[PDB]
Amino acid sequence: GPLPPGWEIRNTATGRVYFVDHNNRTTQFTDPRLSAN
């Protein structure tokens, strides 16, 4: 899928997307989601 193998994607039921990077070990509401559409 359009997800990079280094990236980890989940969306919260609140309607917010947070990608956890196993690289840096951080969660990202700062998403390729809003960065796209």
């Binding site: 919260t12 070990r25 969660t27 509401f29």
Partner: peptide, 15 residues
């Protein structure tokens, strides 16, 4: 993050 404080870093956070 410009959005509200996100889920604590668990690999697969259940929400």
């Amino acid at each position: 993050e410009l959005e509200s404080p996100p889920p604590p870093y668990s690999r697969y956070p259940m929400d």
